[PDB]
């Protein structure tokens, strides 16, 4: 029952942000904005009012591009491959709505419901990939399956919203490449605590989660080979105006402030040491699961040493997590997320309570949670 | 050459916002956020970090609904008919992508390019409506035309981004209703200086303009008869999850902060007196056009007494406004918008410089502009 690695990171992180009113263990849903991030945003809006809205935006180009670059660095793409979105669903929809010719797709059974929804809405046939009892892709079986039965692209949610299994992203991406098939990665969850530098052809993620930037921002990155094959829904493909596929994908009103906010927030991840941060988040999972290994009416779902901060609890006596969550919030200020089946229809047989705490979490807090979980009605 | 009505409104408005670095005459592109609005936004983001992101959002429901209601009041819809968007293009796309059965449409020749683009992208046949030499719809001819040749809906940009003609919105809407045809109104420009209470079946607008709220927010309002006929692209119409058409349209990650920001900003319009504000904006146009009636190399396009703050200048010696604009900004701190043909392809034969100043503008400033316009190379 091993103890915690003391890191000045956990502490710097905590103090860089407003103090939690209660106890916040859902950076997986929406993390917490640093003062700098918050202020960077406010600043932009202030500046919009001074110099003019679109001149302010121009002025922010350095900062916007900063963020692209930072994002690019974490996924191994070019900054010029990275576009801004409203989030990871805007992202996957921009992508799939743009996707040329044949629209077959393989993905995990664990695939995110709203993703499947976008997949379906864009007319993709969607096969499952072989997995283990956890939902972790069997990379071998999948390679064989993908050669035998080819598919127009593979969509890998590298880290799932509903379960803290880290998918073997890089080895699936090579397997898929060996079969001559592109890989889209949903890194909404993964960007910030999984090595997202893995060879993917497109990646997307959201600002508000592990990168702890503003809501209303996400990113989509597409390798230029793929980017230029894409056919944006809007404008129509018979286009008088000459702009690139990515320029088309990034077209539309948006909170630029939030985007500069985001840029700060990514910068801050890089600043803290990507690799340093992921190791802590992995530890956070360990501690979280070791601390929660002993709770009646609640089973920990993920293997102890999954390198992840998402841990999920299945109720062993029919308790509904949705309720437990809103209890935990209203009574004890503890913020959690409650994952309904719709999050992963073809894998979740039963809902779960999701702890997703950041580096800042202490063993006290994990213990406060465990405690408060027991006292829960 | 009549003078200005002194109103404590102009002054209250100015002082409620950060002071303009130079001179800002493009509230038509992006206006200026009050301190309250800016702070309301920051606050939300701060609060996200304290209590949790989605609990903060819940908490803001009062404020969010406030804004719907306020918007609703200005267009004569129910607050429950109003949904939040990213802007007026998200809006028209959400609408047209959702539109059932036959997709014919009539609109002005003056129709906004990006609108036509969305129209086309959603497979609408798009007829023009009869207009005068200004582009103002001939309501009579149009009624006759719409009875003789029916169309699945009419799309009226009530106030055009490229020209400060106020379209006879209410009388066209009855004409269209007398022919049994619904009206969608693009009130991106109009919401805030035209009476948008006119009988339209859907209306949409943006936060960042005359309502001077945050970027990344717009609104879409749809009357329930129409709302429930609509078929959202995403999720697919074969939907396991039971949510209303509007709930579907409002689904997706977003800057909630910005939305509460917006709510403040609408509130502030109501607070100032809608009718009071529009009368000033109309005066602003008068003054703007009277002050600019005498400039060489620049003709005022709109009739003097169009009840509008948008005035546009056509260069009489081949000057490119794009350039003049970026000169005006870099040299004299005067912010303007330069309207390229793409803004209204089937009406604009030639680009224009657009003054769109708010209530705060003084005759000095309009004169400073006129002056600075002369000295421009
Ligand atoms: C993020 N989502 C959540 C609210 C959560 O609690 O998990 C998410 C997204 C959705 O992207 P948006 O930015 O549009 O919200 C994408 N896919 C995954 C795996 C996920 O974690
Ligand atoms: C607003 N647009 C401008 C940038 C301008 O300078 O006019 C606009 C919109 C576009 O909506 P978004 O909120 O997506 O930008 C819609 N239609 C009109 C008439 C217009 O003024």
Author numbering:
A (entry chain A), B (entry chain A): -5 to 371
Pull text from the paper.
One of the key steps in the ergothioneine-biosynthesis pathway, the C-S bond cleavage reaction, uses the pyridoxal 5′-phosphate dependent C-S lyase to produce the final product L-ergothioneine. Here, we present the crystallographic structure of the ergothioneine-biosynthesis C-S lyase EgtE from Mycobacterium smegmatis (MsEgtE) represents the first published structure of ergothioneine-biosynthesis C-S lyases in bacteria and shows the effects of active site residues on the enzymatic reaction. EgtE and Egt2 are PLP-dependent C-S lyases in EGT biosynthesis, leading to the conversion from sulfoxide 4 to EGT. Each MsEgtE monomer has 15 α-helices and 11 β-strands and is classified into three domains based on the domain assignments of NcEgt2.
In addition, we also found the electron density of aminoacrylate geminal diamine intermediate 15 in the structure of MsEgtE(Y106F)-PLP-geminal diamine complex. The geminal diamine and PLP C4′ are both covalently linked to the ε-amino of Lys203. The captured structure confirms the presence of the intermediate 15, which is formed by transaldimination with Lys203 during the C-S cleavage reaction. This reaction ultimately results in the formation of pyruvate and ammonia, while simultaneously regenerating Lys203. The structure of MsEgtE further corroborates and complements the previously hypothesized catalytic mechanism of EgtE, and confirms the existence of aminoacrylate geminal diamine intermediate 15 during the catalytic process. Remarkably, phenylalanine substitution for Tyr106 results in a 6.5-fold decrease in kcat, while a 1.5-fold increase in catalytic efficiency (kcat/Km) compared with the wild type. This implies that Y106 plays a crucial role in substrate binding, and specifically, the phenolic hydroxyl group of Y106 contributes to the substrate catalysis.
